[PDB]
Amino acid sequence: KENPMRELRIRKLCLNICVGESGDRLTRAAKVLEQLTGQTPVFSKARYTVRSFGIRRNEKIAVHCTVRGAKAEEILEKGLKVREYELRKNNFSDTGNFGFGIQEHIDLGIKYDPSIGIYGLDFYVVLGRPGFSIADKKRRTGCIGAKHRISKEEAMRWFQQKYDGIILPG
Amino acid sequence: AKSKNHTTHNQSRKWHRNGIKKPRSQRYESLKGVDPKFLRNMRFAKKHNKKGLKKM
Amino acid sequence: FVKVVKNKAYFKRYQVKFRRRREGKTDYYARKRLVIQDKNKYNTPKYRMIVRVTNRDIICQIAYARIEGDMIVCAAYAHELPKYGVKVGLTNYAAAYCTGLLLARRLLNRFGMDKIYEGQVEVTGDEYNVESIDGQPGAFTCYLDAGLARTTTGNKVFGALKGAVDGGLSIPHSTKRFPGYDSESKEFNAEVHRKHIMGQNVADYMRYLMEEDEDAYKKQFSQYIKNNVTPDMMEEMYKKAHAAIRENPVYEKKPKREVKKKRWNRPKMSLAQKKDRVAQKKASFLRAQERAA
Amino acid sequence: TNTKGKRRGTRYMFSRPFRKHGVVPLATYMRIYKKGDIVDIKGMGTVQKGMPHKCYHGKTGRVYNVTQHAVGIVVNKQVKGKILAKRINVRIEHIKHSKSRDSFLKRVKENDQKKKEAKEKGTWVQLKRQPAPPREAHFVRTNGKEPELLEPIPYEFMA
Amino acid sequence: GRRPARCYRYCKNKPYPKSRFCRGVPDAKIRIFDLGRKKAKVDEFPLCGHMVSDEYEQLSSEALEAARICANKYMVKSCGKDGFHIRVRLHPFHVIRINKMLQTGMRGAFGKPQGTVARVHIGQVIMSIRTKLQNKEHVVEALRRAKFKFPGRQKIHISKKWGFTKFNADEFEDMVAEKRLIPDGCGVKYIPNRGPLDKWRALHS
RNA sequence: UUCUCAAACUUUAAAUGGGUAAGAAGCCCGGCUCGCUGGUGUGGAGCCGGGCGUGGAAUGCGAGUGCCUAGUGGGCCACUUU
RNA sequence: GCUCAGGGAGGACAGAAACCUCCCGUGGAGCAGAAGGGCAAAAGCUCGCUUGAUCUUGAUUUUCAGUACGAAUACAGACCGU
RNA sequence: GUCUACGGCCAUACCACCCUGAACGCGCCCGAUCUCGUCUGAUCUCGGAAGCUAAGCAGGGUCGGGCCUGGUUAGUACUUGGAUGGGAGACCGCCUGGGAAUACCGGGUGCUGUAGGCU
Predict the structure, then answer these.
(1) To the nearest whole angstrom, how far is the Cα of B53 from the nearest Cα of chain D?
(2) Is the dihedral of CA A94, A95, A97, A102 positive or negative?
(3) Minimal Cα distance from C19: which residue of A?
(4) 3-state class of D33 per DSSP?
(5) Are D67 and C40 within 8 A, CB to CB?
(6) How many CB atoms lie within 10 A of CB C108?
(7) Under the phi-then-psi rule, with left for phi > 0, alpha for psi from -120 to 50, and beta for the rest, what region is A10?
């Protein structure tokens, strides 16, 4: 038997376009995520000036957009075809969550433009359980207990069983 | 021409010649330094003590 | 490989916060100002009106500071409204408002200021606040304790605050957090407040769903359907309750059933038990080793 | 010539005890202080407002004035030569009640019940604390066994 | 090079370490504190032999260095390179000050760091030599050579412990027999009967 | 696990040491005043009128108080810390 | 309203280091400056509104001679802010 | 027996992992029309009551870490007062009183206040 209150789902789909090319090439990156998500993103202002990379303190490096629920499933759905329904073992984190990276934004029903060009966006999947939203309230918060967590070994047999997507070695 | 800078050597001997006197232990402390909202009211409490003397 | 953050020595160092701060129930910063009295009062009880909104209940208390543990002087819960008229919808702004009115009129009964300080009997949503009469015993003044609830405009806590203010409690407040306050233009409506107080915020959603589809309505309001609550019955269902609170505010307690005395709980394993388990394990480890060879 | 100041040598005095930092217990704020309450001073470093000067830390005075936060407390800081009954406005977190007076009035009230009783009867009970006297002549029962002979251990060096 | 050790013999000043306040101190002449076959097991060097102070005095870092060399030199000429383990159970932390003259005078006097000195109490171990049960009358000689390198009086004690441990030599062999001790490098690991039983299960496997 | 430590490190932590208290200005009854404080003969403080001397640790000693005032303001030595 | 230093583990370009997530994290950061003390739903941090950085007596503390100035704690009378 | 709301002392209450939790509760939870917010109804807020106590929580467990509390270490260390004591000194001994702290070794693991439930 199974307990469907231990059903595994996606809490949020965290997407970012890290360009490090502020002003012209960063404000046009917002058009990609609004096409992909259907909601307005928040810009990623830097922490300090690194000089080898070519960033500056509080300069807009990236732009991020977290999507939840119904829309979040569909955006993660089409990205897996572009990573041909297979992920490396070491893509999966210790704390249940995972992610991967498709190299070009053009593959997600997004047509080319001589000004838009060839962006790179990066997926990260936050795998959740009913009652993972205890530890972020203003009332009585607490750690979820080790019995209730999602492990890397279980986060495989979510993906390996749900999508029937293979997990390649090498 | 340097000198001795400081001492407290003979001072304890001097302090007990007339005694280290504990301060003037008197009844009725003054109402000096009492919060002047409370002291207004206590001054009014004494002002109208005549009012309830035929009761008294 | 990296260092253990929580060493054998981390816990020698580690100071724990207060139990009510650890459990995440009390803000001791918020409590440090609410509860303590000006020390030139010399034991005047500093009354505060507590409102704690649960998932299925709204707990409204009046308490004052004691070193033993702050003593509750009066308390009315939301589950007492089914003896006045509010059968279901216990945890909405309308049922929050009735509980504030319940706590108010109960304390005023338990003192003898019941007939004095009527307050708002015609429920409006004006800024009414209780003003004491010369000769008649002075109005009960207390202060709202929101707890750990964010006080945005139209928090249910201000429902039970408006309940107390309309009962005969002289509480200082502003109508910024009462609903019907627009943040842009910054006026206050009597009517738009009353829509939430009498429960047309709920009744219009009952109409909106019943107009739209009969699958997502029969899910959303099971007990409003089950126990005959229509949007048209809604407004008068609370009006009947508001005079019903002012009929019988005095509380009759529920009698206890006799304690049969079975322990639902595992009592502590004593020393001679705790020491013998490991003595049996040190038998079980050594008796199950010799069999191998 | 020492660096003069107010909090000079209060590294350990106005420090907080180990694993008793953070939030102040709220009982400290809500215990009542009347006038003529004999009160001992102990500067809590967490609340910087209404601290006493370090020369009063540990010294016991009594209250002549109570406001919203502080109590005007008459203490006997001496000086070099004489003693001065002087008046400091210390906020209530830097202050406890003194249990020195609260062992005397308990002994007044107890030696009043032992006064009321044994008055009408003619019976007499001394109320002065007679000091711990030379202990009365007592018999020491040795019960069978001889008392153990102690003799000094010899010198043998450990380390 | 530096003064006679008469000048800085006695524990006069407060303990004055190389810290954030005293910076610009040269390194002690004793870099390495222990030598021999120190990569050895507990069970093969029972006979510990100590040098024990009589006086509350400061022994120099450069006296501890000479005593290290003198004791090492004899043990190799008796037992070979690998038939002993000598320690120095002092560490020269007390910084010694020098009010140098080349015209200044006592006007503005606080000495620069000269060197490091090891402050010693009475009945305190200066050097310790763990060796085999054979060479009982060599550690006595080896340390007696090194007493001349120190100021004041030192006493040589054949300790009742098992090498550089805190457990008696007549009990050490019988405490490992009941798995109360573990051989762990130079020293031993005392297991209390107070850890979790999954540790006890690992011992008796 | 282990050796060795800290005037400007510290969980612990003395000895000697610093306060305060050991009654009639004290305790317990009442009533009365208030413009302070309030759900409230509430909370406070102050006023009159009371009832109670087993003087409520030991030892010693008569205490208190006000003026006027000279000289001095180079000190040095020893015990123990330093 | 949040939680920091630092670390773990993941994720196109991306590496010791750019960004996005989860977890651990008693303060190991930060609080303009020296150092000490103090502090976690804050005293830190990001914002919303702001002029109590205002006017007026006295008392008190610190240095102290128990004088000043500086600094400071408690009040009280106004007028304000949140 | 046990819980909730508000608490008092603030680890005997913490941390880790595991097992069992009747009833009322407390919760996850259900949705986003209003109120209110957000990149996002996760959070905050509001309107609910289909399914689960899986978690949070509660109580128990651990030859558990910690913590508290005794024993020990030890009348040792140190120290008040004393000597025309010792000793080249360093420092030590005695006399007269006080008297610690780890290592090691046991014991314990929240008591409880006002107001309202449930058995």
Answers:
(1) 27
(2) negative
(3) A140
(4) coil
(5) yes
(6) 24
(7) beta
